Design a protein around this nucleic acid. Structure first.
Ligand SMILES: [Mg+2]
Ligand SMILES: [Zn+2]
Lengths: 1316, 717
RNA sequence: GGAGAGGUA
């Protein structure tokens, strides 16, 4: 059950929940998006094909001719990845599309083909995705984070009484297309209804209703109910609906059937309706006063005069009733209104409506959208139509349509990409209904409303918008005549598309540099989920609500991992097991719970679906049958937790660790620390510098191998095999027989990236972790990358720690460090700096890099060669010369001050058509030889593999081992053999051999071409030389190291070992922390970690002691087995008996520096098991031991806590910060010292410091500081002279910047000046 | 080019970059004197280059500036001693980035160091509010002579010991030395070498160093106090006190003129602060600073000796916690049942649930605190006894070094209830402590709360910066420019009362402000003080023993000085023990004092007297009711409880129309309810007895006969 | 020199 390689070191594991689902591939969400962006999809609903099919075809205005799309293709990348990294160009691919121009016959009827031609026009280059996912623009590999933008669709929102000071809420509704103009409906404080478009001037909505050719009566019919009055013999015996009688009061005597159903002054009881419906009465005689203040539904006209008596939407009055009665009107329809059920919200807006007809409404709309421009009868209609119903300018994506239909309780989850009359009508109906109370407002922070968006969609949109320009160009071209001789090459231009895409990738608010000083850094950065960017809110105008953790984040977004400070809750990281919905939401797995059994089958639920069911959490004690030992089980039902029955549940979590990010997943004993301090620990964990040789953490959380392998640093075998030959540079594996493909056997081979600068100037290289003749298995590690050990993450070093104050040297958070840490040299870190020098072309001719320069002793020149370039491997120091460059009339590059190191790599580049000096030719030749020899070795290795295969296939059916060696490999393929598929295989292998020959013979020439060719360059630059310095920053007081529990500190001193505290056993401790830190900032996780690590180290030490004196495997097997025992029903269950009795020896060897221990974050090891494990060692179970002082030698009373802790050295080096400036350069427009360490700038005496100096009586010093030390030219010149002359005095004068301000003001019409 | 931060005004014309500057990280180096700071060789050499050139040319080692530049460039061995020479008495300035108040920048003498980190005397860290988690500091140098003298005489660290905002010192031993001292001045009931007698602290030190006695055990020892009650004459007087050896050893350090009682308690942080304050108030400045240095040295030494570590075993969980929680849960069950049957509503269920949860949480907290603080039971050489505990956590907490009771409560006991985003409080509290592991949901809720806190902190500091910037802008022009404006108006400073007790006694509201009109003792016609004297401590004591109530004090709001304020109208400096000088820019320091603390702020029936004394009433327009009690008809009526001596002691607002048992000038007993009222409705209370007539009241248009139907009594509205 | 992105206290 355990892999051979796995048996090298197997981490003792705690935890009891049986893992049911392994972590998925972390880097999934990226490669799939970009994969879909570029594919040949026949459905034409993904990536480039959708866009092409959308924009195309294109029809001329006449249109006598059109240009349509056919198909596309991507050419081969011109250069490989490494070449693009070297030169610094984009790793792109040409795009070639076959367009098809057709020509009709003009005089012939509509639809005919006079002629037709086509070609494959080139257009644009699209950057490609590396295997990891990252892109390479200019050898500056970057990464694109994903956005979290609100989804398109509809939203009913409400302002919560935050306006008008009236306490009255105001429900608004918004429609947001995926591409087009927005739309808003709003309720006035006066119950009016206002449309607003793209945040422009407000408008009554009934206007836009009329825009749909809708009249008054149509609208009223749509939006209200009718009440029919009957002019009859006796004064309006009105028909009535009993259902309209809830919530009224009888104002008169309601009587029918000779029965007074109710009298005036009475409220309409439910039982009144009961008796009414029981009597089944419908018509009630009503007094005329009931129609006192009503409004007519439609218009009524006199039949004879044909003149309207009362146009629709008109109040009611007695004389009007008389006119109806004389007009013979019998049916009188009015609006059924109410104050709590049906407010007349439409009627008010209609009365506000100044327009009545379609034309005027459209005209005023046009005026609103475009101020001025006296409209025409066609401008408004064209505007509106192309605005809200032309698919080309307005578009709800499929997601939009789905969400829209969803919100409106529709049935179809598919529809059109544009709007429709019914759509708006239903939207407004729903808004009105919400106003009446039915239906409820919808929040925004719900995860069910915001959508992720990866690279592909954005790239497609950029491609489309670029395409639009060339579309317009070709359309205006085809509108022009002279079509007989056109070609689909002249009208098409590549520049627009190239610009449109290149600008986005190279320069956008989402394509950002990659932090690369860790595997973890790269991983966590790639999984980032930003909320800023185009279409996203702004960093500095975000309220608390966005930053706060909505309850729906559970399991989909890590809540504890975030960059604090100016931007919190905006740079949220993804949770571990989270997936992406087909649409782009966030889904999470859940174990299906049947009637009473917890199945292993899983379903990925979206945010919205979760709100319905009931889910028990991860740590619910079931017993082998999903039968929960308990009965009141904790479950998150819907935005809250509770205890429910043992049968009502529907789903269970997958694993305890599905709530956190990968980044925070690595902190042991997380469940004990505070939240914010864990966040700090994680963020600092993201910044660890790789050490010289990594060390496994004694106490991992078990997530280490996943992170390591999933990252691209380490070289993981792909098909198990056997090491055939190893080297520091490359590896070769003879593939296993079965994994081998039928044809083209070959053998696996790997090459190793040696020391290369990272994105953070930290060298990176790989080292093999296997020897010859070592069997290997698929997916196993082979080459340790940075900060890795045996294919598991290892950032910092584990060290012996003790908690106590010590002479104040650890006063606040200072960390006192013994001298062994540096003597044994386990924290030195390597760095690489690149320095460039160019040869511009200027007046007085150009300048050169000649080795000869004026006014310099030969001492400096001793290190350069004849050409003027330092030799490789030279050990330069601060203030040296690297390349000698001349003043055309001494611009020689020099080492930056203070920096030491060694030159390791030189490179040079020249404009094409320029001669090349000695050194350049030398390097070219050396590269030539290198590539030649490399390919020779590769080819012969492959041929050896092929002939090994050929020998293997001849071992059966005519094997003559003698005959093999009698005549050499040159003539083996031709040997006779029984007639079967074996002969076919022999022919296949021989064919592959010849193919290998030809491939190498051509690839050599290809590489020769790549090398010998010239180099493109920016205008003016004749050549560029780059040099690489390597340095080893070791350690100093001032550096910043930290533990994993957000317990950072600054190293303060390096005591000699003899002063360090030491135990009675003679081992001195290596670090002294300050106990005072823990209680205030509640992080006990470090203390528990210390105890556990001490236990582990004790076990390792016992094993080492057992080994030191020779002890047979008999004792080792026993002791190791017992050690791996003693778990509280742990799931490890490792057996030693099955081992080869020598893997036992190697495992013991790997454990003599401790026994690694695992700890799932929320399934950690409680106190008792730690106590038991300690007692397995001979250490005091209390954890605290007595100590003795280095100086005095006497014992410390009060037994002290000591153990081991894993600690990192962060990337804030003291050498990088310490800086000074006495007198340097000067800004140009204003004469002040420059700023920043890059230049030799000075500090900024800020305004608050001016205030502070004012607070003291200090006046002279302030005056001098802001007059002579910074600004006044003559003042500082004469001050320099005075200081040289030993005379401390100054002459103030006036600041220049004030004169600058004076001139600037006077540039305006303001005459400002100084008086007498 | 003018507006906004980037405008010339706020960018280059008010704040500028400056030459002769440095930037670095900071470390402790506790061995330093309070008046000097470490400095790397490289930065030192870079900064003082011109001085180095001058000295080289004077020594003649370089008869030019170019050769001198070469020599310094390759730093010949000579240059280092030259540097040491130049540095001899040249101060520099240290600054931290967010400098809120006046103390955020200070002068120091330099001491060279072979490092690359600016050492820093730890005591000033509190003033700088500077952690060592990687905070950086900036360095400046004063060039001209006058600048050097200003630095030495105004900005030297040893000159700034009292916060300008208030006379409180600002060099409090912060967190570690305090722990050491508290541990030193403790006493085990029965420790090694107990009951013996010593002939002075030196013997105590020798005994402890030989190890023949524990660092804290009860011993009688003879000592000598120095009382300078005479006119600046330190009279020595010996005695045979009984203390613990640690305290005796500590006494060796204190200067002459102090009472030994000040060094006889457990010495909490407050005790140390008060001790320093008194020492300064008595023996001036220099003894205080040297005493502080010795304090720090000793504190570090003995704290390190103590070896006070923290272990997991220290988090002692109370045994009864589980029982308490189970009982509370069972209690919750019955309420949930009562709501299931509908006997009770939902809101009341919720409120009662919260109440009982709070009660249980309080019980748990109390139980753990009790089980912890007195856990230690030790035989005394008799049979058995108990004492305060030495659990490291409790020692750290009680000493005040770090953490209030809340944090330890969270660590050991249940960490209470958590509030969800909208301000609501979740019904189910977090029942787990950190010694145990929280489950998923609990941690989720806590994470929510913590994020809320962090975001609030960020926005709060952001806004506070703008507030203080505004504040200083409006009051930057004001400078004291006169000695006396010659007026008599002022304001009646009185002790503040909030209905409850004295929120602040008068003694601290008037401390250090000249009077307007002379006070007369309550021997009225007894001139207790002059009308234009400064109220320093002794006169405040005179007032206190005379139980004065309110005082006419000269304010600043009424000073008759034009474009300034006379000295007397302002008062004492509050940055040093004497009147303000002539010229000070009080406005700026006041603005800074007001603005600095802003960051610490937050962004988002019956009368029961409790003391025996005289009752007095003010603004009384009252009558006697039918029951003989007193019913008030004025609104601002105020009730005071005065003691027998005649000084006001308690005060309470009288609501309108409240019944009162007493009259005026009676005697009340502690816990005697004296008044009552209805807080809900408003009556039409009358004054005199007689018939009531419904005048100008006709049913139909003035009144309605809305007679009560539930009972049947006459009613018209 | 100016913009934009990220990061530390
Ligand atoms: Mg800090
Ligand atoms: Zn005055």
């Amino acid at each position: 059950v355990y892999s051979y390689t796995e048996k090298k070191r197997i981490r003792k594991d705690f935890g009891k929940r049986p893992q049911v689902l392994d972590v998925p591939y972390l880097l999934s969400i990226q490669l799939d998006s970009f994969q879909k962006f570029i594919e040949q999809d026949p459905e034409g609903q993904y990536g480039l094909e959708a866009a092409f099919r959308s924009v195309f075809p294109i029809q001329s205005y006449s249109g006598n001719s059109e240009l349509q799309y056919v198909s596309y293709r991507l050419g081969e990348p011109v250069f490989d990845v490494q070449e693009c990294q070297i030169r610094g160009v984009t790793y792109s691919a040409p795009l070639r599309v076959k367009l098809r121009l057709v020509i009709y016959e003009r005089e012939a009827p509509e639809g005919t083909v006079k002629d037709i031609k086509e070609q494959e026009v080139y257009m644009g280059e699209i950057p490609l995705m590396t295997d990891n996912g990252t892109f390479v623009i200019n050898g500056t590999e970057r990464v694109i984070v994903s956005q979290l933008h609100r989804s398109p669709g509809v939203f009913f929102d409400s302002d919560k009484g935050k306006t008008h000071s009236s306490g009255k809420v105001l429900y608004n509704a918004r429609i947001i297309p995926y591409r087009g103009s927005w739309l808003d409906f709003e309720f006035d404080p006066k119950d009016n209804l206002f449309v607003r478009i793209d945040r422009r001037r407000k408008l009554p909505a009934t206007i836009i209703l009329r825009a749909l050719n809708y009249t008054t009566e149509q609208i009223l019919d749509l939006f209200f109910e009718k009440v029919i009055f009957e002019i009859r013999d006796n004064k309006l015996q009105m028909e009535l609906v009993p259902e309209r009688l809830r919530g009224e009061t009888a104002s008169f005597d309601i009587e029918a059937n000779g029965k007074v159903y109710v009298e005036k002054g009475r409220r309409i009881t439910a039982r009144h309706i009961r008796q009414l419906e029981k009597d089944d009465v419908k018509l009630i005689e009503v007094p005329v006063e009931y129609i006192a203040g009503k409004v007519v539904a439609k218009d009524y006209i006199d039949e004879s005069t044909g003149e309207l008596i009362c146009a629709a939407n008109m109040e009611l009055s007695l004389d009007l009733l008389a006119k109806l009665s004389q007009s013979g009107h019998k049916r009188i329809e009015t609006l059924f209104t109410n104050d709590l059920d049906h407010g007349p919200y439409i009627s008010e807006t209609l009365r506000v409506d100044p327009t009545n007809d379609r034309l005027s409404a459209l005209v005023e709309i046009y005026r609103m959208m475009r101020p001025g421009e006296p409209p025409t009868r066609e401008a408004a209609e064209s505007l509106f139509e192309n605005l809200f119903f032309s698919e080309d300018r307005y578009d709800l994506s499929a997601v939009g349509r789905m969400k829209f239909n969803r919100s409106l309780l529709r049935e179809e989850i598919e529809g059109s990409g544009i709007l429709s009359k019914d759509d708006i009508i239903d939207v407004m109906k729903k808004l009105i209904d919400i106003r009446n109370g039915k239906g409820e407002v919808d929040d925004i922070d719900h995860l069910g409303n915001r959508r992720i968006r990866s690279v592909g969609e954005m790239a497609e949109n950029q491609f489309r918008v670029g395409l639009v320009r060339v579309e317009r160009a070709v359309k205006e071209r085809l509108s022009l005549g002279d079509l007989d001789t056109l070609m689909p090459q002249d009208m098409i231009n590549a520049k627009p598309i190239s610009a449109a895409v290149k600008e986005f990738f190279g320069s956008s608010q989402l394509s950002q540099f990659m932090d690369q000083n860790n595997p973890l850094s790269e991983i966590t950065h790639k999984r980032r989920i930003s909320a800023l960017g185009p279409g996203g809110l702004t960093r500095e105008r975000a309220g608390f609500e966005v930053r706060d953790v909505h309850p729906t984040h559970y399991g989909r977004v890590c809540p504890i991992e975030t960059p604090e400070g100016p931007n919190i809750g905006l740079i949220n990281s993804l949770s571990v097991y989270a997936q992406t919905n087909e649409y782009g939401f966030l889904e999470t797995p859940y174990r299906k719970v049947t009637d009473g059994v917890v199945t292993d089958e899983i379903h990925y639920l979206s945010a919205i679906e979760e709100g319905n069911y009931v889910i028990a959490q991860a740590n619910s004690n079931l017993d082998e049958e999903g039968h929960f030992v308990e009965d009141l089980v904790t479950c998150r039902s819907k935005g809250e937790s509770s205890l429910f029955s043992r049968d009502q549940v529907d789903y269970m979590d997958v694993s305890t660790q599905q709530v956190v990010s990968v980044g925070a997943s690595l902190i042991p004993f997380l469940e004990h620390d505070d939240a914010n301090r864990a966040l700090m620990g994680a963020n600092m964990q993201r910044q660890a510098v790789p050490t010289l040789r990594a060390d496994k953490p004694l106490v991992g959380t078990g997530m280490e191998r996943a992170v390591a392998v999933d990252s691209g640093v380490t070289a993981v075998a792909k098909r198990g095999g056997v090491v055939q030959y190893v080297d520091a540079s490359r590896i070769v594996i003879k593939v296993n027989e079965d994994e081998m493909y039928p044809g083209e056997a070959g053998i696996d081979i790997y090459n190793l990236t040696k020391y290369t600068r990272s994105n953070q100037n930290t060298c990176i290289n790989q080292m093999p972790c296997v020897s010859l003749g070592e069997p290997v298995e698929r997916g196993d590690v082979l080459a340790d990358g940075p900060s890795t050990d045996l294919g598991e993450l290892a950032l910092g070093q584990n060290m012996r720690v003790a908690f106590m104050p010590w002479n104040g040297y650890n006063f606040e958070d200072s960390i006192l460090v013994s001298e062994r840490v540096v003597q044994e040299d386990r924290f030195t870190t390597i760095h690489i700096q690149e320095l460039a020098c160019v040869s511009r072309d200027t007046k007085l001719g150009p300048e050169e890099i000649t080795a000869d320069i004026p006014n310099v002793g030969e001492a400096a020149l001793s290190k350069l060669d004849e050409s003027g370039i330092v030799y490789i491997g030279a050990e330069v120091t601060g203030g040296d010369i690297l390349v000698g460059k001349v003043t055309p009339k001494d611009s020689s590059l020099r080492v930056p001050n203070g920096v030491s190191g060694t030159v390791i790599d030189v490179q040079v580049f020249t404009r094409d058509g320029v001669e090349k000096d000695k050194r350049a030719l030398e390097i070219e030749e050396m590269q030539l030889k290198q590539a030649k020899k490399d390919l020779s070795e590769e080819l012969q290795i492959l041929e050896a593999g092929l002939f090994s295969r050929i020998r293997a296939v001849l071992v059966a059916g005519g094997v003559e081992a003698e005959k093999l060696d009698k005549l050499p490999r040159d003539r083996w393929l031709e040997l006779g053999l029984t007639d079967e598929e074996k002969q076919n295989q022999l022919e296949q292998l021989a064919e592959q051999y010849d193919e290998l020959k030809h491939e190498f013979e051509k690839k050599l020439e290809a590489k020769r071409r790549k090398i010998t060719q010239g180099d493109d360059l920016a205008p003016g630059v004749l050549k560029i030389v780059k040099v690489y310095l390597a340095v080893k920053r070791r350690i100093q007081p001032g550096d910043k190291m930290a533990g994993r529990h957000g317990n950072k500190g600054v190293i303060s001193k390096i005591n000699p070992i003899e002063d360090m505290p030491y135990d009675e056993n003679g081992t001195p401790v290596d670090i002294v922390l300050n106990p005072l830190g823990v209680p205030s900032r509640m992080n006990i996780g470090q203390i528990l970690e210390t105890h556990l690590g001490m236990a582990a180290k004790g076990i390792g030490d016992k094993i080492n002691a057992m080994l030191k004196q020779q002890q047979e495997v008999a004792k080792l097997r026993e002791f190791i087995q017992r050690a791996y025992d003693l778990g509280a029903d742990v799931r490890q269950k490792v057996d030693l008996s099955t081992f080869s009795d020598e893997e036992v020896m190697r495992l013991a060897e790997n454990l003599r520096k401790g026994m690694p221990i695992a700890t799932p974050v929320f399934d950690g090891a409680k106190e008792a098991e730690i106590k038991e494990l300690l007692k397995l060692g001979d250490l005091p179970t209390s954890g605290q031991i007595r100590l003795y002082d280095g100086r005095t030698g006497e014992q410390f009373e009060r037994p002290v806590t000591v153990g081991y802790m894993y600690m990192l050295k962060l990337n804030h080096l003291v050498d990088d910060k310490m800086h000074a400036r006495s007198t340097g350069s000067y800004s140009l427009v204003t004469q002040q010292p420059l700023g920043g360490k890059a230049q030799f700038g000075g500090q900024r005496f800020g305004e608050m410091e001016v205030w502070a100096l004012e607070a003291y009586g200090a006046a002279y010093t302030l005056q001098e500081m802001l007059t002579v030390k910074s600004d006044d030219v003559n003042g500082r010149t004469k001050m320099y002279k005075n200081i040289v002359d030993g005379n401390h005095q100054m002459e103030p004068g006036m600041p220049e910047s004030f004169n600058v301000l004076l001139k600037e003001i006077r540039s305006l019409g303001i005459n400002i000046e100084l008086e007498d | 080019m003018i507006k906004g931060k980037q405008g010339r005004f706020r960018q280059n014309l008010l704040g500028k970059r400056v030459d002769y500057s440095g930037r670095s990280v900071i470390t402790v180096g506790p061995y330093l004197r309070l008046h000097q700071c470490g400095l790397p060789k490289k930065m030192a050499l870079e900064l003082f280059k011109p001085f180095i050139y001058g000295k080289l040319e004077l020594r003649g080692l370089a008869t030019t500036i170019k050769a001198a530049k070469k020599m310094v460039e390759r730093e010949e061995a000579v240059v280092w001693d030259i540097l040491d020479e130049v540095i001899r008495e040249h101060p520099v300035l240290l600054n931290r980035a967010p400098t809120l108040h006046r103390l955020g920048i200070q002068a120091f003498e330099p001491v060279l160091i072979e490092g690359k980190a600016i050492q820093l005397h730890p005591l000033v860290c509190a003033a700088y509010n500077a952690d060592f988690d990687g905070d950086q500091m900036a360095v400046h140098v004063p060039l001209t002579l006058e600048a050097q003298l200003e630095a030495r005489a105004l900005m030297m660290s040893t000159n700034n010991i009292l916060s300008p905002a208030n006379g409180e010192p600002i060099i409090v031993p912060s967190q570690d030395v305090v722990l050491g001292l508290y541990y030193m001045t403790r006493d085990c009931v029965n420790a090694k070498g107990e009951g013996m007698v010593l002939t002075g602290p030196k013997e105590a030190e020798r005994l402890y160093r030989s190890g023949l006695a524990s660092l804290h055990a009860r011993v009688k020892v003879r000592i000598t106090e120095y009382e300078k009650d005479a006119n600046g004459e330190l009279v020595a007087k010996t005695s045979l006190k009984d203390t613990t050896v640690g305290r005796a050893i500590l006494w060796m350090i204190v200067p002459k003129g102090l009472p030994y009682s000040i060094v006889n308690q457990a010495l909490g942080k407050k005790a140390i602060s008060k001790m320093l304050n008194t020492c300064y108030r008595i023996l001036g400045l220099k003894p205080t600073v040297i005493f502080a240095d010795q304090i720090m040295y000793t504190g570090f030494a003995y704290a390190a000796r103590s070896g006070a570590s923290v272990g997991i075993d220290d988090m002692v969980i109370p045994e009864k916690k589980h029982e308490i929680i189970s009982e509370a849960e069972a209690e919750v069950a019955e309420i949930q049942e009562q709501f299931q049957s509908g006997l009770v509503t939902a809101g009341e269920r919720y409120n009662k649930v919260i109440d009982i949860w709070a009660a249980a949480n309080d019980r748990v907290s109390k139980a753990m605190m009790d089980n912890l603080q007195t856990e230690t039971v030790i035989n005394r050489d008799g049979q058995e006894e108990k004492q305060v505990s030495f659990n490291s956590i409790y020692m750290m907490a009680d000493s005040g070094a770090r953490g209030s009771a809340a944090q330890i409560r969270q660590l050991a006991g249940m960490r209470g209830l958590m509030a969800k985003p909208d301000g609501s409080i979740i019904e189910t509290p977090i029942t787990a402590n950190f010694r145990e592991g929280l489950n998923v949901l609990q941690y989720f809720i806590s994470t929510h709360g913590a994020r809320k806190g962090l975001a609030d902190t960020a926005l709060k500091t952001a806004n506070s910066g703008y507030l203080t910037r505004r504040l200083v802008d409006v009051a930057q022009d004001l400078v004291v420019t006169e000695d006396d404006c010659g007026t008599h108006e002022g304001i009646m400073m009185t002790p503040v009362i909030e209905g409850g007790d004295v929120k602040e006694p008068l003694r601290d509201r008037v401390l250090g402000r000249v009077t307007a009109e002379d006070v007369l003792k309550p021997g009225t016609a007894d001139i207790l003080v002059p009308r234009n004297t400064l109220l320093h401590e002794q006169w405040c004591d005179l007032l206190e023993e005379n139980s004065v109530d309110a005082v006419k004090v000269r304010s600043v709001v009424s000073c008759d000085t034009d474009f300034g304020v006379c000295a007397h109208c302002y008062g004492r400096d509050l940055a040093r023990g004497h009147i303000i000088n002539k010229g000070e820019a009080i406005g700026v320091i006041a603005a800074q004092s007001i603005g600095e603390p802003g960051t610490q702020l937050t962004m988002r029936s019956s009368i029961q007297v409790k003391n025996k004394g005289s009752i007095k009433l003010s603004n009384v327009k009252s009558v006697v009711n039918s029951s003989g009690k007193l019913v008030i008809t004025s609104r601002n009526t105020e009730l005071k409880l005065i003691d027998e001596f005649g000084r006001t002691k308690e005060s309470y607002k009288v609501p309108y129309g409240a019944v009162l048992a007493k009259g005026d000038g009676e005697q009340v007993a502690g816990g005697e309810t004296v008044a009552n009222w209805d807080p809900h409705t408003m009556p039409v209370i009358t004054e005199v007895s007689g018939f009531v007539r419904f005048t100008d009241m006709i049913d139909g248009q003035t009144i309605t006969r809305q007679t009560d139907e539930l009972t049947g009594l006459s009613s018209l509205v």
